[PDB]
Design a binder for this molecule. Structure first.
Ligand SMILES: [Cu+2]
Ligand SMILES: [Cu+2]
Ligand SMILES: [Cu+2]
Ligand SMILES: [Cu+2]
Ligand SMILES: [Cu+2]
Ligand SMILES: [Cu+2]
Lengths: 335, 335, 335
């Protein structure tokens, strides 16, 4: 009822940049809450590869992907979305988790200099994409990086197909972005003064359905080297993966997805013992794995051209003790 | 036996043009029936976009997609298929729902001026693609629009994964078509005086595996404006979706798939609470949704380039009262 | 322990060429074993189409795909991998079935003239891709044919979703391969006299994400005509299908997938009554079907351009008596 909603507790949360995730509890603390987030939209030039290739990103909270928001089923998510006067374009937000008004898009169209506050009830548990979607320019905003995900945890937290609690020690959010960067006749990537300048050239590339780059966390190598994700043997990790526009097929090289909600929806029982899972464009999925071996793992989109040539590869650096039962080199490489 | 089959009641059905579906009962009335359908194939020029782009379509019942035929499990589907002498090509039909002879393809090869009658037992419940498949010319016929779907309902109607009856108030059939239209050196679509004139140029485009157009009900915007699908708050709608040649990833913008038979087969428990489902090329799927919010919804292939640039977008106009518990604008776009 | 493993029975298994599979028991013979395989890597020219197009194949056991290795859950797979001096490249192996060191890749890097012996515990039941993945050269080896699959059977054989036993009479392994063959200025496929000579040209084609050829068992027609797979009405057949780099959507034309482990993993219950299933790039899947009709069946990737234009089509030739209840030509094609 009116009073019931009015009387619910309100709680502000500080966001953190992907692949890290803000403070949350797996089991819901008490009854339904109105969980409050604020994101400022930033239009800005980003460098997406080691050749200095530039995109005019359109970035929720200044990042590609935008940050993971975490709430529980039947909480309310209340987003203040801010479009500073320094931006050039109108923006909005479509939460796939939400019901009504084009996911919120119809209620959140903000010009530069405007802000809005949207509340919705998170009625369905799962990981879900969100993305900007201005009428008439939807894909251009999405493929300029204006997308992220949220997670709506069951109130009792995660469970396997038998209702046994699944509790992660850490969580990472990998947002995968297909970029479409115009090139000149000499094959060199083009640069533009303002976002709108690139519109016509970019749509032409979009229509080929062939990304120039496919990247995690906004750039080639963003989650490799000193920025590899980490775990220890014995540690239970949840990996949330989203792709707002194009299919992907995540794979943990050297590992598995012990439980994978490939559709991203927690009331759909997870697949198990997965090698390579599939997330369609416009969706998020989640994989749960318990690390068994130390070492460097690669986490990839298993179209290995996309992974190795186009940028869709991350690493995990895992500490701990080798398990010779699971794997051993009986004879090391030799003549 | 032939004698028992001959003793079964016949029902002659009048097909209707997609996205509408001929009158049927969700729960089968009586025992197995021989359900009779007739379709005339029409080779016809169709306009697929607002610019006036033309395709020489090959159209079951004169429409792209072909109409949805509805029977119950263990009914027999008896199709009279006619290839009028005004056509120039040989045609046939492959029913994915059928068992033997290349889905019926082997038994239904008809030249212009010929007809045939094929009967098959609908032994498996689900939605299934049908399409033309003439030896040596299979993809050309299919991507010229010569495909549709059937639905084989369980005799006891639909149920969810857990024995709850699911009874829809209305059903729509969205057929999605990838088209491969040749262009001139100035990037303008080519027209051909005869279907044959288009062939070589079309196979070249087909080889790029990149359609020029991806459309619902035969054309860009075919299911928008005054041809939008309709519903009301509280109404239960089944959306059957097919793609005979190429993957798709349906999404109801502002909604969900409450129950999605993503593989299209009713003995495979549906996924639930879906944001974006996946239907592989050569299959049909179905989603069941109860509308909770009024207004415009877009229904899209959620590669948003395919939706917004290439044509794969439809609308639903939904009447009724707004639910502020589910979503509200706390603060409308403001300075 | 190492001692306990050293004390387990060793079995030497002899590999057979796809699509055939080496002798095995569906239900496990005795307790865990160390199952021993040996494969020599062969770099050779293969001809992949009727125009005499050549690929520099990198072939496990001299075939594309490499052979299917069959073990049971909690057996040990011990592979001796040999890289002869007649080869020019460094190679390794990543088993998606294995846990640690990039699936074995980190421990199996062998130059020509070298060999290695890897052992891993097959802890998860299912069909799983394996492939070469040399640092810095991963997609190039994979798309040159350096991949296959293994099957790790549940010790008690296959069951359906309800633990009812599923026993096949025949098993076939179909390896699907996307090839990226460079062309000259006139659209002719290029030939090279060393694998390395083709590298740069191939990388350029790979980056289009558009294969020039998509084939089964290494070439157009490799599993059609005389080389059709065979079955009889009433026989239960398991069809294993893998694709190491790119999505596929298998379909048995005239048939179905009665049970389909679309993810390839046996602890994930199978989909049923399938028309067309989906296997993401980097994975294997398996379909079980009981033939009910005799004749030619086509088994395809149901992107029909990929099947009929690019080469992704096989045949089954099935003996037996026609079932007129299932399907009958009521009226044969007639004027
Ligand atoms: Cu935007
Ligand atoms: Cu969306
Ligand atoms: Cu036809
Ligand atoms: Cu088909
Ligand atoms: Cu290799
Ligand atoms: Cu791999």
């Amino acid at each position: 009822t009116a009073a019931e909603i009015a009387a619910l507790p309100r709680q502000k949360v500080e966001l953190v940049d992907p692949p890290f995730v803000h403070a949350h509890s797996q089991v819901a603390e008490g009854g339904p809450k109105v969980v409050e987030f604020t994101m400022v939209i930033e239009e800005k030039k980003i460098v997406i590869d080691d050749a200095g290739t530039e995109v005019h990103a359109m970035a929720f909270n200044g990042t590609v992907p935008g940050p993971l928001m975490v709430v529980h089923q039947d909480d309310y998510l209340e987003l203040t979305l801010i479009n500073p006067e320094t931006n050039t374009l109108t923006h909005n937000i479509d939460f796939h988790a939400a019901t009504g008004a084009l996911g919120g898009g119809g209620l959140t169209e903000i010009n530069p200099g405007e802000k809005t506050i949207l509340r919705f009830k998170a009625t369905k548990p799962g990981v879900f994409v969100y993305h900007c979607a201005p009428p008439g320019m939807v894909p251009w905003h999405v493929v300029s990086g204006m997308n992220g995900a949220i997670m709506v945890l069951p109130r009792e937290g995660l469970h396997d197909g038998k209702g046994k609690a699944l509790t992660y020690d850490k969580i990472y959010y990998v947002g995968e972005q297909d970029f479409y960067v115009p090139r000149d006749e000499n094959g060199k990537y083009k640069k533009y003064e303002a976002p709108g300048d690139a519109y016509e050239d970019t749509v032409k590339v979009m229509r080929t359905l062939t990304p120039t780059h496919v990247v995690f966390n906004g750039a080639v190598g963003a989650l490799t080297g000193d920025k590899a994700m980490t775990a220890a043997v014995g540690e239970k990790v949840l990996i949330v993966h989203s792709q707002a526009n194009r299919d992907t097929r995540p794979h943990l090289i050297g590992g598995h997805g012990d439980y994978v909600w490939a559709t991203g929806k927690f009331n759909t029982p997870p697949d198990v013992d997965q090698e390579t899972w599939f997330i369609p464009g416009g969706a998020a999925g989640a994989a749960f794995y318990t690390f068994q071996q130390p070492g460097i793992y690669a986490y990839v989109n298993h179209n290995l051209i996309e992974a190795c040539e186009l940028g869709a590869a991350a690493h995990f650096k895992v500490t701990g003790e080798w398990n010779d039962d699971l794997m051993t080199s009986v004879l090391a490489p030799s003549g």
